[PDB]
Design a protein around this ligand. Sequence first.
Ligand SMILES: [Mg+2]
Ligand SMILES: [Mg+2]
Ligand SMILES: [Mg+2]
Ligand SMILES: [Mg+2]
Ligand SMILES: [Mg+2]
Ligand SMILES: [Mg+2]
Ligand SMILES: [Mg+2]
Ligand SMILES: [Mg+2]
Ligand SMILES: [Mg+2]
Ligand SMILES: [Mg+2]
Ligand code: NA
Lengths: 23, 53, 16, 52, 258
Amino acid sequence: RKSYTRPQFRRPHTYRKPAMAKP
Amino acid sequence: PTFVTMQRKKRVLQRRLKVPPALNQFTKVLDRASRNEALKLIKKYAPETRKAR
Amino acid sequence: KMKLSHKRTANKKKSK
Amino acid sequence: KNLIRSVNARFLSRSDVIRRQWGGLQLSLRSRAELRKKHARNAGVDAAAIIQ
Amino acid sequence: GKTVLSCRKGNGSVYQVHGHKRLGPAKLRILDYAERHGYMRGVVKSIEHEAGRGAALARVEFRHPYKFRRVKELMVAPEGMFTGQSVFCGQKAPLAIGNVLPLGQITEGCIVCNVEAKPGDRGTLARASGDYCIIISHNHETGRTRLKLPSGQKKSVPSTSRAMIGIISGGGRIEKPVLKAGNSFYRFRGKRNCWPKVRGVARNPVEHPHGGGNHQHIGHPSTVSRHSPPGQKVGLIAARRTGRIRGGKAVKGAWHPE
RNA sequence: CUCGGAACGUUGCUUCACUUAUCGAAUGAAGAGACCAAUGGGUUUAGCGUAGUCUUCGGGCUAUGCACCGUCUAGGUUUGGGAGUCCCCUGUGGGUACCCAACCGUG
Ligand SMILES: [Mg+2]
Ligand SMILES: [Mg+2]
Ligand SMILES: [Mg+2]
Ligand SMILES: [Mg+2]
Ligand SMILES: [Mg+2]
Ligand SMILES: [Mg+2]
Ligand SMILES: [Mg+2]
Ligand SMILES: [Mg+2]
Ligand SMILES: [Mg+2]
Ligand SMILES: [Mg+2]
Ligand code: NA
């Protein structure tokens, strides 16, 4: 398991593919 | 998170309460060595894939 | 604390 | 054949036990520790009531 | 008929607390690890007055137990608290006025205030000006402490619940006659909209059970049942007795044989 | 028609002990409990036995022993062992006086 130094859980940052420019 | 707390609390409630034999029999599993041997035989006779068929 | 340790050791050598 | 014999030892031949055995009723580690400590505290608080 | 004033106040509306200019709720610090095992030493930085409260409030600065910062709690100051005083809070705090200790650590017969009804509730009993609780006895078998509340009732609480040594500051406030309606006006400015008070017999019967009649009178007994519905439950609610008390004031409130 | 008991099976209520439903508080859910050890757990790190009792003969079940899970500490007290005061001038600066075990204690 990991280690959490904060008393509440927050959403981890994940990979975010950027939106493509539409025609 | 709520789902994390609930899935841990679910295991606690399953162990604290009185489990009837119909459900309790599934906690008395086959031993590891026999389980590995059985799954090896199953893998040997696995069904053919879409390609091979 | 050092005084107690020395007294304990001195008593040890005195008793033995 | 060996696998059939092994699984029969655990499941088929033990049918009567499997049909009757209830599960659960397991205390937590903290509850088990608390019960053990309580028994130790009250270990010999009844020695004077024994005639022998 | 119409809704009685006592029922209307339940809606909130214009009868709510005048909370502006108040400094915030007054409480002990959080019952954290340091309090349960050691102690936390703070410094009284200011003694301040809050509108609608007779007791003085103390701003006490603590170091953060886990982070590089300060906390600055706000408590009800006991009588004798002064700026620069060191406040000790925890299991190992010494018995001195202004310190916060678990009740089980406080000797019987001591006078306490800011008493926690529940462990960690941060102080709910003996908070009004000049009030205090008296420690009657400790019972280690059940881990409880018996107290004499300011009203006279005796109450048992867990021994891990904390209390502050001393009496609440600002005592004797009710000893000075008001002498003027205007002084009451200023008194209630910081509390709520509940003054002046109109007698029920002076109202009309549409809005109050005591209203009406060709003489100002209550034509029925003013002692009403506990089970009376709102709008009918006015007067002396569920009174066990009436009239001038003679030969000793009994302790009021509900009867708890425990 | 009236009372005395089993010892089996089940239960109408109810004492006590318990904790997982539930309820009340508090907290940024910020340090719970144990290691100090069972009237615990374990064939998926548990194993070794013994005595009954079953077996579809593979192995279980009930007891009862042994071992494993399973580990450390501030401080307090007393038991063994080894092993390194000096510069500058009366004063100044630098430094050495330990380790383990047992009992209490519990973080
Ligand atoms: Mg309001
Ligand atoms: Mg009036
Ligand atoms: Mg009129
Ligand atoms: Mg009417
Ligand atoms: Mg009238
Ligand atoms: Mg009149
Ligand atoms: Mg009148
Ligand atoms: Mg919390
Ligand atoms: Mg602890
Ligand atoms: Mg110990
Ligand atoms: Na009349």
